[PDB]
Hints:
Chain D: One of its GO terms (biological process) is cytoplasmic translation. Chain A is mainly α and 106 residues long.
Amino acid sequence: AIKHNQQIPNNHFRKDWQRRVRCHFDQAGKKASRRVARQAKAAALAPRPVDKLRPIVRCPTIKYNRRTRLGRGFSLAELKAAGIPKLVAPTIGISVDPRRANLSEE
Amino acid sequence: GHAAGLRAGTRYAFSRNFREKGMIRLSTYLKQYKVGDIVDIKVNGAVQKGMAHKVYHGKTGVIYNVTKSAVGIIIYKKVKHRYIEKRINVRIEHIQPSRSRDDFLRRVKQNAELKKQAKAEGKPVQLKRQALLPREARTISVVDNKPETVAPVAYETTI
Amino acid sequence: VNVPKTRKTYCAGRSCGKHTLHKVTQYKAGKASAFAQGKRRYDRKQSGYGGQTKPVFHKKAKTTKKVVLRLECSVCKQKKQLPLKRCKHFELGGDKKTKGAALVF
Amino acid sequence: AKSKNSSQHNQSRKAHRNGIKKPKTSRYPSLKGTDPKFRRNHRHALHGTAKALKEFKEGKRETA
Amino acid sequence: PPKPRKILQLLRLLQINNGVFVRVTKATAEMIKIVEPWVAYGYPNLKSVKELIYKRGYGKVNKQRVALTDNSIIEENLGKYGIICMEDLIHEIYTVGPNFKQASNFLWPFKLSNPTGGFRTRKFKHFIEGGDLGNREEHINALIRQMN
Amino acid sequence: GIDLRKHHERSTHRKAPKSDNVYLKLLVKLYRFLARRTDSAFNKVVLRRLFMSRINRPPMSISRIVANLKGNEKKTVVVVGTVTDDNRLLTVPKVSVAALRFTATARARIEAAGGQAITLDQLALEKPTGANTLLLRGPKNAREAVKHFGFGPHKHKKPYVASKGRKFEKARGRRRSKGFKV
RNA sequence: AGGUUUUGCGCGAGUGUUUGGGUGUAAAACCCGCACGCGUAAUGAAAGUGAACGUAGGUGAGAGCUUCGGCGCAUCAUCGA
RNA sequence: AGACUAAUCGAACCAUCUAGUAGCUGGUUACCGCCGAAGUUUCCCUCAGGAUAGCAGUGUUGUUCUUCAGUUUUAUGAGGUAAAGCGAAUGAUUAGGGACCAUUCUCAAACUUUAAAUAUGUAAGAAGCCCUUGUUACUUAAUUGAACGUGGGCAUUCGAAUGUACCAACACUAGUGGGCCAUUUUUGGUAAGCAGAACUGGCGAUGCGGGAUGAACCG
RNA sequence: AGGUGUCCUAAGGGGGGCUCAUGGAGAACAGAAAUCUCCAGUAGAACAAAAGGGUAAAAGUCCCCUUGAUUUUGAUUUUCAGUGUGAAUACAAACCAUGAAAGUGUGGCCUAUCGAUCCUUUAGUCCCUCGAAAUUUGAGGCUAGAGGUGCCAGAAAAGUUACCACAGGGAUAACUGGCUUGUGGCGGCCAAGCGUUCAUAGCGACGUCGCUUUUUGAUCCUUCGAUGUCGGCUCUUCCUAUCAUACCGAAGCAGAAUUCGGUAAGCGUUGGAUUGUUCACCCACUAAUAGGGAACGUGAGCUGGGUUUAGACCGUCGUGAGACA
RNA sequence: ACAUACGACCAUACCCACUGGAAAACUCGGGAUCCCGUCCGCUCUCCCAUAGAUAAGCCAGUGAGGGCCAGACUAGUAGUUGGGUCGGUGACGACCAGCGAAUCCCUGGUGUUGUAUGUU
Ligand SMILES: C[C@@H]1C[C@@H]([C@H](O)CC2CC(=O)NC(=O)C2)C(=O)[C@@H](C)C1
Ligand SMILES: [Mg+2]
Ligand SMILES: [Mg+2]
Ligand SMILES: [Mg+2]
Ligand SMILES: [Mg+2]
Ligand SMILES: [Mg+2]
Ligand SMILES: [Mg+2]
Ligand SMILES: [Mg+2]
Ligand SMILES: [Mg+2]
Ligand SMILES: [Mg+2]
Ligand SMILES: [Mg+2]
Ligand SMILES: [Mg+2]
Ligand SMILES: [Mg+2]
Ligand SMILES: [Mg+2]
Ligand SMILES: [Mg+2]
Ligand SMILES: [Mg+2]
Ligand SMILES: [Mg+2]
Ligand SMILES: [Mg+2]
Ligand SMILES: [Mg+2]
Ligand SMILES: [Mg+2]
Ligand SMILES: [Mg+2]
Ligand SMILES: [Mg+2]
Ligand SMILES: [Mg+2]
Ligand SMILES: [Mg+2]
Ligand SMILES: [Mg+2]
Ligand SMILES: [Mg+2]
Ligand SMILES: [Mg+2]
Ligand SMILES: [Mg+2]
Ligand SMILES: [Mg+2]
Ligand SMILES: [Mg+2]
Ligand SMILES: [Mg+2]
Ligand SMILES: [Mg+2]
Ligand SMILES: [Mg+2]
Ligand SMILES: [Mg+2]
Ligand SMILES: [Mg+2]
Ligand SMILES: [Mg+2]
Ligand SMILES: [Mg+2]
Ligand SMILES: [Mg+2]
Ligand SMILES: [Mg+2]
Ligand SMILES: [Mg+2]
Ligand SMILES: [Mg+2]
Ligand SMILES: [Mg+2]
Ligand SMILES: [Mg+2]
Ligand SMILES: [Mg+2]
Ligand SMILES: [Mg+2]
Ligand SMILES: [Mg+2]
Ligand SMILES: [Mg+2]
C-alpha cells in the first residue's frame, strides 16, 4: 500500500506484539529499592568496603584495545607474584579469576 | 491505435510531389549551417536514413550541433500541459534555412543603416514597423471615367 | 541460415587487439553442476512434507531459440560469443548458394 | 459492464489551467551531447582565453 | 469560446456594459472582428468623448480605481507626456495623439449603465439585420447617451 | 459578474514572524519603523529576513565570513542568522560582524581577535541605514532534505534508504547486469 | 513504534542527563559521567583506495553595498579542477 | 429421501483462536470565512480496485525597472481534408462513329494532375548588430574558419499591436480516475431518449428571470 | 481490408558494367508461350514475406573483393510517467572491409518480425572472497550473452452444483413501462396489365409515401435491503381499422344473392369435442359468431393445468459428478 | 554573341517531323604492339590527328504539331469559419460578418544563367 516517495517500512509488528509490551513505570520505584538494598549491604559489610578489588585489563578487540577497563579478578600469576595465597585473597576483598592468563610482563 | 509505429499515416507527408521525384538536387548538400541558425524540417522520403519523426515534419527549430552530414535541432514539443525540449539529429537532406529569419536579418542590417544615416544627417527616423493605418482624405476625379449605375439582375435564365 | 566455419573479426585478447581469423562453432549450453548454490538451496526446500515449493513452467510459446556462436581465436586461443536471431534449421556447413543454376526436380 | 473507452474531452481545459509554459533557457546552453571533437577543443580554447586575460590583467601581456 | 475570451481580456472588457477607447489600425481591427458576437462599437464624437470622461472617467493609479475630480491626478500620472489636465486628456483621446496608448490605458474601463429606452426586440444580432452587435458607424453616440 | 481568473489571491511571502520570541518582536518593531521611515533598501531586506523561518536562515561560519571579506574590510558584515565557528580556520582576523546569534565558540574567537560581535539592534544604532555593510547569506541548499527533493529517474538525487550497503537499492534499475540502469 | 515534509525552540561541528549512579520536600525536581546513537567522507561485489594547479577556479545573471570605479551573498546556467 | 443425529444437517451444538478477512453495502456528531476539482495518460490476474502523471489547497522562497500571452499584424514553412477531375495516371462505367483512334453519360473511405476555409510551426533583437584583435590539442593548402572572448560604437523610440485584473520556482498533500448533454464534423445501425469518436461550451458542483411544466435550451 | 512470432553468409558491406515489365518487326524445325537481332519503351518490372512510401549510368540485374551482422560505453528519437522493453538516428575512440578516390559500411531501402527479478550455463576478468595461516580442488563474486514467461511490464492450476451459501449489483440479463419500427399489421400515390372490347365496377405488378404499437426484434433508462412471473374463470369500461343491426352512394346491381364505399361504436358478437394452451381445427346454432386496449387489465379475486426448487423414470451427451426451451 | 570543360534551376529545356549551319571547337573518324576487356577492338582500352564529312550527334529555324509554362474565363461559383428564439415537416436553404477554390473551352510563350579557356 505504498503511496508516495516514502522510505520502505521495517516495522516488525505482525506477531501479536501487544501481549508482550513491557512498560517501565517502575523505573523510579526500582531505583529507590536498589538504593535501599545497597544501604543494607553496606551496613552489614561495615567496616569492610562494599565491593572487591579488581584488576586492570585491556579490551579484547582492535576497536577497543586502545582502552583499559576493570577485569573480573586477579590471575593466579599476579596473586603469586604479589605474595598472597589464592584462597586468602577472597577473604580480604580481592577478586580472584583462575581462568585468566597473562601473556605479557607489562 | 491498433498500429502505432513510425511512418504510420505518412503516406502523403513523406511522399514526393508528382513530377519532382527521382534525383535530389545538389544545392541541398552545398548549403552551410552554423550553430544558431533557424531551419525548417521537411522530411524527404527518397532518403530513408536519418529521418525525423512525423511530429517534427513541418516544424521549425534552432541548430545546436553540427556533425559531418547531419545537424542537431532543438524543437519544443507540446506534450499535454507543458513544452519539452527535443534535440533531433536530422540529415541536411531533410532541412532548409527558414526565409523568415533571413528576412529579419536583412531588416536588422537595414535598421542600422537608416539609424546611422539619420544620426549623421540630423533628423529622427522611425524604426518600428507600423501596421496598416486608416486611409486619409483623398479626392477622386471623374473627368475620364464616370460612375457606372449597376442594378441587380433578374433570375431570367433557368439554366 | 548458413554460417561459415571461419570469419575474421576483432579479437580483444590483450595480445592481438585487432582482426584475427576465428574458428566458429555453435554454443551448446553445458549442464549441470549439482553443487551450485541454487541447486543446494532448492534441494533442501523440496525435502520434507511441504510438497512442491517453487513454480513449474507449463506454458510455452516460443518455437525457436537464438543461436549463439562461439568464436575461437587462431592466435590468442580465447573464445568470444556472438548471438544471432531466432531461426530454424541452422547449419555451419557452408554449402554456398549458386545463382543461375538449373532447378532439380 | 461496458464503459467509455477513451476521451480527450476536458484535457485542453485541464492543461491551460496553469498555462502551457516553455522551460526557461539560460545564456549558456549545455555543450554535453555536441560533437566530441568540438567539445574537447572548446575546453582548451576557454582555458587559454582565461590565461590570456589573466596575464593581460596582471601585466605580463599587453594584447588581451 | 477560448479565443474570444482572450481577446476580450486583451481589450479589458471583463464585464457587460464596459467601454474602452481603441485606435484602429489593422491589428485592433482584426481582433474586434472576432469578438463581434459580444461587442457593439462605432465612431464617438466630441460630446461622447467629453461626457464619458467627465462623468464616468476614473484613473488607474497604483492598480487602484481613482476618481478624476481634479487635475492633480492627471498631472501626477500622465505629466511625462504633456497631459496635465482633463482637456489635455480629452484632446489626446478624441484626436489620436502620440501618447494615446498611455492616455487610453490610464483610463479605467468605463462602467456604463443599461440604456434608457433601449435596446430593441432582438439585441444579439448584427446592427445591419436589426440587432446591436457589430459596427454602428456613427450611431454609437445615440447609444452612449442612453447608457451614460 | 466579471470575468476574472483569480479572486482574493494572497501574497505568497510571510508578513510577520511565527516566533513567539518577545525579544524578536521588539527587533521587528524597530525594523518596521526603520524600513518605513528611511529610504534605505538595506532596512527593507533585513526586515524581510527577520520574518523568515529557520530553514531560510541557514547558519554561516566565520570561514565563509572571512572568505567574502576581501577586499571588503572596513565594512560591517551583517548576517540575519547564526554565525558558527570553524575548526578548519586556524586564525581569525579582526572583523565586525552583526548577527542574530553567535555560538559561544564563534563569539569568543571573534572577540579575542579584537573584532566586534554585535547584535542587529546594536547595528541599527551606529548604522541606521547600512552605510558600510556586507549583507551575507548562508548556504540555503546545503541542507540534507534538499538532497532528496525532486527524486526521479535520471535525477541523481538521494533516495530514502534506511541503511547503506550492497543491498536495499543496488540491483534492478541501478545497473545493466540486473535489468536496466535507472 | 518507525519514517518523511513543514512550523516553533535550545545548542551548534557537534548534539542527546533520566541504561545507570548521587541526591531529594520521595513515581516529582536537581546533579553526574563512561560508553553509545546520529552527523562530521565517500566509493567499490570485494581486496581496497580515499577528496585544493589556482584568493576553493573561470564565464553570465544576481539582492545589497559603494570611495560611483567597482565589489558582488544566496541561488541558477555553463566550462573546468 | 442427502434422510435422521434434541423445532439445528450437502457435515450438530458449546467455548476459544476472534474485534478472523472483506477491492463490497450502510453510517460517520458545532458555526463562519477564503480557495476549489476529476471521471483523463501509462502499468497492473487490470475492467466495482490500485500505483503513476494531470486538475486543487496550503506553506513558502528569488524577488517585486520580476516577465510573458488559449490574442491580432507583418514575414516565412508544413499539410492532402471540403470542393474539384476523369476528352489526365489507377479502378468502375453508357452509347454511338471512323479505321485501335477521335468523342460521349456517370463515379471512388482504403484513386488523383489540382486544391481551399478553420486550425498549425518559427521569427519580430541588448543573451542583439558592426570594427579591430586574442585562445584552441577542432578545421583549413593557409592566422583560412568554428566556438568563446578582451577593447571600442549603437540607449531606452532596445527595432509590430494590445494586455499584464496570470512574475518564477519549490515542498507536502487531498479528492478524482463510473460521467452525461448540446451546436458543427463523423462511425456502426432501418432506427433509437442506441453504441462509439474530434473541437468547444455546459450539467455534475448552480441558484436566478423566460421556455406553463423540465440537469443541459435562451438571458 | 489485411499482416507478424519467420527468412537470408547473402537477400549484409564496398566497387564496376548494364536496363527493366511490355509492344512492334524479323530468323530452320519453332506454333500463342523456347532462343537470337533491331526499334520504341518514366518504371506500367524487381527490391524474401501484408500494405503504403522510395529507387533508373539505381536502391533493380550480373560480375569482383570481403565480414561494419566486430570492440567500448555514452548522447538522441518513437511508444512515454518523458519509466522499462522493442526498434531507430547522429557522432566519438579502435580494428577492419571496399574503391583510383571522394567517400560508404555498427545487418536486411524505411515502417512489424519480440522478453524482467530469481535460478542454470557460457565468454571475459593474467581479477576479488571463503573472515586463525598457507597450497590445490570446490563454491561464491564483477562485466556481457543464452535458456522464458504469446494472459507477450512476465501465478505454477480441471470440472459440476436442479442440495447450495455469503458480500453486493438495476454498473448487468429474464416479466411491465419508455424511445425506435427493421419485422408484423393497416392505409395511400402512379398506372403495365386482368376483367367478353374496357387501366381505374372490382383488382392492381414494377416502383413509392405513410400510420399504429394488438407480433417479434433492437436498446438497457427505472426496479436485485423483490412491482408475485402463463393461461383460464369472473367483472367493468374504453378504441375503430364496422362482423351484424339503422339510414344511404356505386357495381361487370333485371330479381334473389353478393362485392366496394359514407355517417355511425347506440346495441350485440354463442354452445361444444382435442390441447395448460394464446393460437389452431372441426360439429352446431346464429342477424353476426369483428379486431384490440386498460402494468401482455384482473393470484391480500379464485384455480394451479403449465411454467418454476427439492423425489423419481427414460433417450441422447459426459470417464465421472452431472446437462438437456 | 558563338564554341568547349565543369555546373545551377531541372520540359518555356521534353517527344515527332522538315529545313539550314561562315571561324574554331565538339563529333563521326583511321589502326590494334604495348596498358586493358569482350563470343565479337560492338562497348571499354591504347596509338594516330595525316585522309574524308557535316550524313549522323550538337546548334538554330519551321509546325494553326503533342506536351509543358503563364494568363483569362469558369467565378465571387463550389466550398468553408463565426451568428440569430432565421425559413422549411424534413432533406436542406437564404441572410449578417469574413475567407474563398478546381475542370472543360480561349489566348500568349517554347529556356535563363555562372566560372574558366578560346573563337574570326
Ligand atoms: C522457464 C525456465 C525457468 C525460468 C526461471 O527460473 C523462472 C523463475 C522466476 C523467478 O521469479 N522465480 C521463480 O520461482 C522461477 C527462466 O528464467 C527461464 C529462462 C527458463
Ligand atoms: Mg509531401
Ligand atoms: Mg538501415
Ligand atoms: Mg522425503
Ligand atoms: Mg472509466
Ligand atoms: Mg421607462
Ligand atoms: Mg459580484
Ligand atoms: Mg547518558
Ligand atoms: Mg559522539
Ligand atoms: Mg562555480
Ligand atoms: Mg438428489
Ligand atoms: Mg431435527
Ligand atoms: Mg466479525
Ligand atoms: Mg501479471
Ligand atoms: Mg458502488
Ligand atoms: Mg494524484
Ligand atoms: Mg488521410
Ligand atoms: Mg469529395
Ligand atoms: Mg480538379
Ligand atoms: Mg479515369
Ligand atoms: Mg502562420
Ligand atoms: Mg490516485
Ligand atoms: Mg457525483
Ligand atoms: Mg447554470
Ligand atoms: Mg551501382
Ligand atoms: Mg526506448
Ligand atoms: Mg565509420
Ligand atoms: Mg539490399
Ligand atoms: Mg550466478
Ligand atoms: Mg535473461
Ligand atoms: Mg500486460
Ligand atoms: Mg469446487
Ligand atoms: Mg443455481
Ligand atoms: Mg443448471
Ligand atoms: Mg433480451
Ligand atoms: Mg412498421
Ligand atoms: Mg430492462
Ligand atoms: Mg440500467
Ligand atoms: Mg428486481
Ligand atoms: Mg422496492
Ligand atoms: Mg403489487
Ligand atoms: Mg369510421
Ligand atoms: Mg402491449
Ligand atoms: Mg390484485
Ligand atoms: Mg423436480
Ligand atoms: Mg454412457
Ligand atoms: Mg432448463
